[PDB]
Design a binder for these strands. Structure first.
Ligand SMILES: [Mg+2]
Ligand SMILES: [Mg+2]
Ligand SMILES: [Mg+2]
Length: 62
RNA sequence: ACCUGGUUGAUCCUGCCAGUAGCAUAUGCUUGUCUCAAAGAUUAAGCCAUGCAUGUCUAAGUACGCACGGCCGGUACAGUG
């Protein structure tokens, strides 16, 4: 009758693309699953994982 | 005549005795000050309570534990862990 949510989204870029059916022209950074987090006595915040296997200028320079 | 003394009618042979200094094992009485070193052994390589004796991170493999935290709408990832 009830439901238990899945708690973690994908982290590798290709797995994000597979989950959200993205193309090559789509920006992976736009579709990162952000997690809201709010403890009593602390201001609300939102955290996202670090994308892995993401092409950046540093990799191209290497 | 290869130490000093003993075992004979004389000369000898063979068995012997006592004194003299150390090593090892065990054990006594005494022990004010100071420096250095040692520590096994029942043919038992026999039996063991308890604790300890081996762990490790740099700018540089992997952090979405608010576990703690600055800046924010630019918001993939500040940083510590
Ligand atoms: Mg990488
Ligand atoms: Mg004689
Ligand atoms: Mg290193």
């Amino acid at each position: 009758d009830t439901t238990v949510p899945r708690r973690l989204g994908p982290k590798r870029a290709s797995r994000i693309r597979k989950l959200f059916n993205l193309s090559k022209e789509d920006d992976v950074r736009q579709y990162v699953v952000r997690k809201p987090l709010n403890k009593e006595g602390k201001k609300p915040r939102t955290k996202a994982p670090k994308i892995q296997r993401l092409v950046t200028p540093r990799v191209l320079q290497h």
